[PDB]
Amino acid sequence: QVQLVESGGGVVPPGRSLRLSCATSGFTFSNYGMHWVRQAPGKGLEWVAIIWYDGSRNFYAASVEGRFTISRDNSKNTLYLQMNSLRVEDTAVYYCARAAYYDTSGYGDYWGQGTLVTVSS
Amino acid sequence: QVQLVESGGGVVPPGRSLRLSCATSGFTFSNYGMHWVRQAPGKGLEWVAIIWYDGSRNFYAASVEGRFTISRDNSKNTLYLQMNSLRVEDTAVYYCARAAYYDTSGYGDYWGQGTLVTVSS
Amino acid sequence: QVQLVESGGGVVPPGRSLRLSCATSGFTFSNYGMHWVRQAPGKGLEWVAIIWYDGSRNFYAASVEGRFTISRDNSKNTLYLQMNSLRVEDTAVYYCARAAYYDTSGYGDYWGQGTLVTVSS
Amino acid sequence: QVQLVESGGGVVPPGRSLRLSCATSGFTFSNYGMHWVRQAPGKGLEWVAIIWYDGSRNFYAASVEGRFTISRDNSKNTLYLQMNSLRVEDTAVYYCARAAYYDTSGYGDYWGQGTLVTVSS
């Protein structure tokens, strides 16, 4: 079975950093790309970032590019997200999802439990 | 001349692991990739797993990913298949095959005799 | 915050070369193409050159082709413009812009501060 | 400046081959298609062949198709014409011309110097 457990959340005042993580088990981690999706409390889903299976190609959303950093460690089957200069509008629930590609578009076959990050002062 | 001799079968209660082995001779083992194909009695062939010649890349079928482990030893010309948490639907005959690539797809030029594995309660 | 910081300008007598640079920060440099645009003193804007994200395709304006050379360094997040055999008509203010594409035509969403090259005897 | 130089001409008896070349400088070779045009001594101009910028498409005149072969090398900026089974009707001056396209028809903006190929016995 596919298992995606997440950690690293909490509460931080705006202006400093935070680091998430998504530990995986039950599948070959190095053969798949990974995503990050966030959902603001009471809002919809927002795609955040993607990383290639080798880490060569990274893509970020327009609202998070330049501040967030996505990385993976194939030796520990873990996925990271480095958040810098956090703002109030970044408060949401962060999911790690596994990448899949059908014909001409991608989707997420398996998702994580979700972790909540709140920015307040 | 290519020979692929297999072993490691038996009768196992579900939920406990078992290890296959496929001894090769007549060709440079460390210069080719290997496949595992299984065939349930009265059914067709089902591709299981593949390993690169150096072992860098491993690809598994969906039904066996996370439970089956395929490994190779270049100093002993031995191909291994470590199958954990066997279930009843795993009962089949496994064949170790040699990998060949023509233009845009792979195929198995030489196959092993095959052994029967039994999972029952 | 996307930043494009330029340098390399100055006074050069006609007949010799000059090299510009456009240091980047705040975005993924390797995912975007770049442009060069110039503005002669008191004149309008003139498109000069473009480079692909991987550097495979280069396009130049007819008035600069064969003399100017555009290249990028994906590891330093820097862009170059190598100008050879400068003519008096090459005096202008040089900008680097980030590429974008909407439906059927492209535009530049983020521009640099600009550097000014004077060529005279 | 655009500079197209031809070579490979000379005197050959009918029935065998001859290979011309048009070395170019002063522009990006791989962005443009190229033409061959021949002019018989004392006659008008005759279009011979075209090649795409990537080499995917080739077109030939009805009188030369099956005998002539046009090819390019984007790493050496050199255009070739392989001429087999030469006839006395093939004695002319061959020009290489850079391709261009305006609205509904194409023209040649820069031409080479030309080379003389004569067939006699």
Next chain:
Amino acid sequence: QVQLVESGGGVVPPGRSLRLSCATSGFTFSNYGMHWVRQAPGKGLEWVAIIWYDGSRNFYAASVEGRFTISRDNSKNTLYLQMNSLRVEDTAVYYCARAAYYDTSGYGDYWGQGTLVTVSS
């Protein structure tokens, strides 16, 4: 010299399939569409099928649509015609022709040798 050579004829019982081919030389196969034309013994000519230069479009006569299939392989310069559920009325000599278009209609500008397909019981 344009050469169209056909093969694959013979005697076939009614109700089963047969495949014809027309190997080509002397021109750029991928630049031209092709036709199939058949002639019953002692009768006139009948148009059978056409295929576009890229294979994107196929057209068939009303008497053979749903049973015949025309295809091409640009890498081997070969044209095919798969005939399924053959009937006695399909006994004729089949010709492969090279398509040409003048002003408002098309003609066949070089033809093959022809092959005889006999359906009898």
Next chain:
Amino acid sequence: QVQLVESGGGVVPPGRSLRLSCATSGFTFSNYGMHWVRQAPGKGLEWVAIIWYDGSRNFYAASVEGRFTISRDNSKNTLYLQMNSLRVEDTAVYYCARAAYYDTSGYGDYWGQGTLVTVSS
């Protein structure tokens, strides 16, 4: 042989939607336009809609325009009819017909079997 098989009928309360389909075989689907025709119980035939071979042009009857939608999927050889805001007078047997054009008017050479749509409360 030309085969048109229809499905998607049934019973639907007035005010909501329903989708029909007409699967085809035995001819090149992407070469022909298609029609929808309906017949109220005990009444005559009534033309409903047409779609072009490429799907560019759609025409509807005055009594169904704005509510019914016609579409096709050339990769599955299927013709659809999306029926929205169904009323009581839309109770009829629906046929799919293959378009043909003779001199100045069109007809349908091949028809489907028909499916019954009943709108009732």
Next chain:
Amino acid sequence: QVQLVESGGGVVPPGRSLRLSCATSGFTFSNYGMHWVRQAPGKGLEWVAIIWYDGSRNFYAASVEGRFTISRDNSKNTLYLQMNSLRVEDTAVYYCARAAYYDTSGYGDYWGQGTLVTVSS
């Protein structure tokens, strides 16, 4: 100067082994890979085997894989070629040649004298 001297040929009955060698001088043996090529009487050349400079990677032809063994002792400047279970088809003149690599292919800059191995009964 590069000197490659071969010894160890002769006449051997089928079914048994015969060991060859190729002595080297005038160049750094340990810094080059090197090949084997055999020529049957009245036939062309046929590649046999190559060994890496460190001996890590061995490649054999399909006809002799599993029977021929190539080994090098860089402290004696001699490459060894073991041929086990010789067949009558192995009668050929074996060549020892140094390995060279230009862009994407291999070739032999220096060749040896060559020795004859005949299998007859």
Next chain:
Amino acid sequence: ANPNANPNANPNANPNANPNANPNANPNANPNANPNANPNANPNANPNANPNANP
């Protein structure tokens, strides 16, 4: 009007087409591409390599 495909059209390639590279193409990386490992490649990947110590 006629709703069917026209069989009386030119079935040959058009030589009157632009033979030059298109400057109006997307110069940016494609975010919609397969991010996975492509389980279709030569698994015996020792096809050809330099057998010497240096390139």
Next chain:
Amino acid sequence: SVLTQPPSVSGAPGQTVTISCTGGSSNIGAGYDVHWYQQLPGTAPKLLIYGNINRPSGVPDRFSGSKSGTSASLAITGLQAEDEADYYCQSYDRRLSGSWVFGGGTKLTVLG
């Protein structure tokens, strides 16, 4: 929210409801696939329909969907008590530099 969805629809158990997702000429009308996700109130989203017609093993046969033109829709038949969840449509929009684009999210209420 490039993809537009009705904020809420409802239907009594045992009836057929239809959730739609409207796009444009750049995301759905360009030929890109549409995928559907279901989120129960207290858990993460779960894949519901991929490939515009295909479904995973756990998803029952009740859920179905198709696209046409610039619109795609998710048809649900046989409403049940556990169908209370948020439904999102996803595609790829050619105009931005992101892998996925999500819709607003349609809430299905079972008229119990």
Next chain:
Amino acid sequence: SVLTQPPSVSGAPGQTVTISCTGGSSNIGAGYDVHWYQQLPGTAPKLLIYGNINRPSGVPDRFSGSKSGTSASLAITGLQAEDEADYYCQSYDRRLSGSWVFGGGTKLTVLG
């Protein structure tokens, strides 16, 4: 055979004969071109005239053709013994779904 032709035409050597191919208002009367093919007794057809007036390199000046109204004609002047062959007219009919429509075919016998 939407285009009808005389089944046979004969003439003495050295004189002029005419082969006609008359159609309707949908193929020849609609403005579509007429092309002619020649089939010698034991070989495949060979192109004779295209564009209603033009001939390939191999075809001699003896053959010529023209069309007017709904009829097209092939004019052969100065017959030889090697002119014995079947002649077919080819055009496009608007009322069918085919690229070419052929005539019945006229056999020319030279009275040697």
Next chain:
Amino acid sequence: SVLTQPPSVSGAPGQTVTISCTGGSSNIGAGYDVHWYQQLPGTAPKLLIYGNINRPSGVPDRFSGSKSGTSASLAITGLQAEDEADYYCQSYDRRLSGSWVFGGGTKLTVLG
């Protein structure tokens, strides 16, 4: 300067002005997008409108534009003291080998 712009346009504060950008049948009449830039007297250009109707975050609602046929115009309402700048239209011309073609450049004078 393929695209034609009037060299200057002016208006009183609080009134509406319209800046025009007229091209030919190869750039704007061929279906390509038109994008607008704003350049203050001493700074680099800033993107104003892209896609003929869209605008970035920093641009207020006062600026708006559209295109029709061969002509594309930028409509500005509620003139302010900070609106004095050079406004360029940019598109793609099919007849050259460059990505962008710019206009001449209009100067907007606010009658303060």
Next chain:
Amino acid sequence: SVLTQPPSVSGAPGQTVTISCTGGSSNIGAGYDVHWYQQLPGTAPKLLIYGNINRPSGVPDRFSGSKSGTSASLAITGLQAEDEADYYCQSYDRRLSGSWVFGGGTKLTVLG
């Protein structure tokens, strides 16, 4: 079993029979090679055709095959008694994460 094969075929001794393998736009119609395997009732499968046209040394000239569009076919001429075996077709599917995809399996019975 994305590739579809007939469950059983038959043929008299000396006649010609065909085994078909039907795929889709993702496996066979996307340009991937099709390979055929023959398995005796009591042993492992053995390679029969690779690359849609090529066979190993052991396979006799009776076995031949080809591909076209989204379908593939294995042709066996001159049926023998020892031809009774299960025949499989193999290709690669783009939409999955597996190197090989096999078909349903065709059983050939000779009507002795």
Next chain:
Amino acid sequence: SVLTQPPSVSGAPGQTVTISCTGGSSNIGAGYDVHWYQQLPGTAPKLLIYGNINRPSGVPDRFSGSKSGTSASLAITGLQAEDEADYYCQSYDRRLSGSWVFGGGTKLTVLG
């Protein structure tokens, strides 16, 4: 040579001369562009006019061209001593399989 040009045209220095190029309904009358080339006695051709009205940088204002209907014309005003050269008109013929079709070639001699 599908395009017809007068073999020679002459005029006195300082006067205006015109070189014509007449085509058919397939090359010029079909809407395709006409371009002009100038070849001095001992050098390769040089582009003179493209797009039927436009000229390169080196070409002076004396040369001008236009097209209408089935014919096109090249107008030279103010003949000089160096204008003795061959002038070719090039277009595209719909009825061939070639990128360019040239004219016969007109030799211009100024009466100096």
Next chain:
Amino acid sequence: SVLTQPPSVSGAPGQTVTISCTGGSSNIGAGYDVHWYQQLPGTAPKLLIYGNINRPSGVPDRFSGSKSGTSASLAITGLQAEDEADYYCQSYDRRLSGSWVFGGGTKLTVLG
């Protein structure tokens, strides 16, 4: 023997003859280099051309070669009495497990 070479070619002394090696899309058409070897009747083969254009110091300037597409050729000018030898073309094949592949070989004869 994946590469094809003519069995034997001949020519007069001092003339130019062409030795061709025709490959496929997997060996020569795949972008791999072609190397030529000249084997004397009584000694081992000697390197002649490498990198498709480069020759060793010992090889005279008469020998030359080039490649295009799936074919390569060896051009020999000024045939001499010592040119009588066997010539082989060598490349690399992607579809095999061999470093080098050798052609049939051409026997060159000089009509002394």
